[PDB]
Amino acid sequence: PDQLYSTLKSILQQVKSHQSAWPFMEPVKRTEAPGYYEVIRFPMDLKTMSERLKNRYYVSKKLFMADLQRVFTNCKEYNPPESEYYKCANILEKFFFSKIKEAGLID
Ligand SMILES: [Cl-]
């Protein structure tokens, strides 16, 4: 019945439990990232996604995927190519795509 939330909740949990999710668990802090909030204008992280999900913001699959996609693209825009974050972004992205295909949110 409440099917979309349950599906989105399962995917976000899997993504947050993945061994490469750790750079993305919290908002980037100004202190640790020179000039992030000048270059990345729509920041996103998995804690904020968890909140939005709880707050019933994800009324469409499109809104959820756009937010999760933003986590990865923000990462790749800012971090160096062979940095551990960039490697994490693409591994987690690959896992994201695998799971949203398995749930038929893309098909
Ligand atoms: Cl609830």
Residue numbers in the entry: 725 to 831
Provide passages from the article that reported this PDB entry.
Bromodomains (BRDs) are protein interaction modules that specifically recognize ε-N-lysine acetylation motifs, a key event in the reading process of epigenetic marks. The four helices form a deep cavity that is extended by the two loop regions (ZA and BC loops), creating a largely hydrophobic Kac binding pocket.
BRDs are evolutionarily conserved and present in diverse nuclear proteins comprising HATs (GCN5, PCAF), ATP-dependent chromatin-remodeling complexes (BAZ1B), helicases (SMARCA), methyltransferases (MLL, ASH1L), transcriptional coactivators (TRIM/TIF1, TAFs) transcriptional mediators (TAF1), nuclear-scaffolding proteins (PB1), and the BET family (Muller et al., 2011). The nuclear body protein SP140 as well as the related protein LOC93349 and PCAF showed nonspecific binding to most peptides.
